[PDB]
Each structure stands twice: as structure tokens, then as C-alpha cells.
Amino acid sequence: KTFLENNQYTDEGVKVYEFIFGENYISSGGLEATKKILSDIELNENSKVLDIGSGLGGGCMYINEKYGAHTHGIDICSNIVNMANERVSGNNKIIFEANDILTKEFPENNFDLIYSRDAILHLSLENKNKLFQKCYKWLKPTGTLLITDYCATEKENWDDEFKEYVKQRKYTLITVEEYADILTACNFKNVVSKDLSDYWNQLLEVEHKYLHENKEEFLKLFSEKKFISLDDGWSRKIKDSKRKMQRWGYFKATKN
Numbered sequence: 365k366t367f368l369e370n371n372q373y374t375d376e377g378v379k380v381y382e383f384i385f386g387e388n389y390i391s392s393g394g395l396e397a398t399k400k401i402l403s404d405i406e407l408n409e410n411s412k413v414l415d416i417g418s419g420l421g422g423g424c425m426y427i428n429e430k431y432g433a434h435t436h437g438i439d440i441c442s443n444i445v446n447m448a449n450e451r452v453s454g455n456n457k458i459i460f461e462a463n464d465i466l467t468k469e470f471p472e473n474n475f476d477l478i479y480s481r482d483a484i485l486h487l488s489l490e491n492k493n494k495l496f497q498k499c500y501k502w503l504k505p506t507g508t509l510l511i512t513d514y515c516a517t518e519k520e521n522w523d524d525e526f527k528e529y530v531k532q533r534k535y536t537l538i539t540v541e542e543y544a545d546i547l548t549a550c551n552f553k554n555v556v557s558k559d560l561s562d563y564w565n566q567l568l569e570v571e572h573k574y575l576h577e578n579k580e581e582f583l584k585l586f587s588e589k590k591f592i593s594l595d596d597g598w599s600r601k602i603k604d605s606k607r608k609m610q611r612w613g614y615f616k617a618t619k620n
């Protein structure tokens with residue numbers, strides 16, 4: 365919690381990410397990607413949804429808007445939850461809670477959809493497995509697990525630059541195939557994994573173009589130093605996704 369709040373997700377860090385990803389988002393593709401990721405998902409006003417790593421709340425906002433579903437977002441960063449809370453009012457079907465998902469308890473057979481977007485990369489391998497075991501219990505018999513997450517080629521293939529990025533971020537990045545195998549080992553059914561690295565590359569390019577075309581505005585809100593860091597960061601993701609060193613994984617599975 366302290367590592368994340370004092371580094372990657374300081375208040376300013378979150379605002380910089382939001383500038384490039386889009387209002388209410390701090391992960392890949394913002395609203396447009398969310399529309400696509402949820403395009404084949406069916407829920408209604410009676411559905412219960414858990415968003416693991418809910419961030420600024422964009423995903424809960426969209427799911428509630430699209431389906432009328434009850435949404436409950438959990439995020440470990442209290443500053444981010446505070447921001448999320450500031451942007452939703454008068455809606456008793458959107459709840460945000462500051463807590464570590466690894467210690468959170470929910471009733472078994474509780475959720476119609478457990479949803480997570482680029483959050484589980486923060487967890488160690490041991491903790492990814494522990495989390496998915498919890499998710500299995502927490503899903504309703506008829507429920508669905510829906511995840512996007514940063515993945516990577518096998519570690520043996522990483523270059524110096526990518527090693528440094530992963531180290532600095534304290535990410536644990538595994539292959540798409542390894543990730544799918546964890547879900548299978550947790551007894552999820554109908555496990556579908558997709559390597560969406562090409563689509564991710566397209567999303568990164570749109571964001572990179574946006575950053576460049578709105579540089580003046582960015583400099584006013586932030587600084588040239590932060591612009592350079594962001595610009596170079598996206599440049600590396602574009603290069604590394606093109607060559608499949610850094611990947612974007614999509615996973616969907618059911619309890620039965």
C-alpha cells in the first residue's frame with residue numbers, strides 16, 4: 365500500500381495517468397477499451413459485480429451505466445479511492461472501498477461478475493494464485509471472471525531495459541499461457557485466454573498521438589520532466605508490445 369501510494373500512484377502520478385488514459389481511468393485504452401472488453405457480457409439491474417483494483421472508478425461507472433448493475437470496487441490505495449468517491453454522487457449502486465483484495469472477505473457465491481483491469485500485475489505469483497482461489501469461491505455458480513492484465517514473454521528473454529521497468533514497478537509479469545494455467549489449476553471452466561498485444565499496441569498508439577497533440581496542455585498541468593517520462597514510457601511499451609516482449613492478456617472464465 366505505502367509503496368504504491370508513495371510512488372506509482374501518488375496523487376500527481378494518478379492524474380498524469382488519467383490525462384493519457386482518459387477521464388476516470390488509469391489503465392490501457394480507457395473508456396473505449398472498456399466498451400470492447402464488456403461487449404459480449406450480459407448483466408442486469410439485479411447483477412452484483414466486483415471490480416478488483418477499481419482505480420478512479422471508471423469501470424464501475426460504465427458497468428452501472430450500461431447494465432444498471434450493483435458495482436463494488438476495491439482498491440488498496442486510499443488516495444485513489446478518495447478521488448473515485450469524489451466523482452460519483454447520489455448512486456447507491458456504486459460503492460468504492462479502500463482495502464487490500466488479498467485480505468478482503470466476501471460471502472461464497474456472491475458475485476455475477478468479478479472484473480479486473482490491469483491490477484493483478486501488482487501481485488506476486490503466489491498471491492495471484494491465492495487471489496484466484498478466492499475469486500472462485502466468491503463467484504456465483506453462474507458467474508463469470510473477466511480480466512485484463514500485463515503479461516510478458518518468458519523471463520529468460522527479457523532485455524536490460526525491460527528487466528529494469530519490471531523491477532522498478534515491482535510487477536510480477538508472467539506469460540499469457542502461465543496465467544491461463546493458473547485459472548485452470550483453480551478449477552475455473554471455459555477458460556479463454558487471448559493475447560491482445562496487437563490491439564494493445566493500437567491503444568498505446570492512440571494514447572501516444574493524444575499526448576503529442578496535447579503537449580501544451582500537459583506542460584501547463586504538469587511539467588516537461590513528467591512529459592518526457594510519460595512519452596518515453598509509452599514509446600517503450602509500443603516497441604515492446606510490437607515485438608511481444610511485453611504483452612496484454614485477456615482472460616474470461618466461469619465457475620461452472
Ligand SMILES: Nc1ncnc2c1ncn2[C@@H]1O[C@H](CSCC[C@H](N)C(=O)O)[C@@H](O)[C@H]1O
Pocket residue numbers: 368373388389390391392416417418419420421422423438439440441444463464465466480481482483484486487
Ligand atoms: N492488492 C491490491 N488490492 C486492491 N487493489 C490493488 C492491489 N494492488 C494494486 N491495486 C490497485 O490496482 C490498480 C491498478 S491501475 C488500474 C485501475 C482501474 N482498474 C482502471 O482500469 O483504471 C491501482 O489503483 C492499485 O491501487
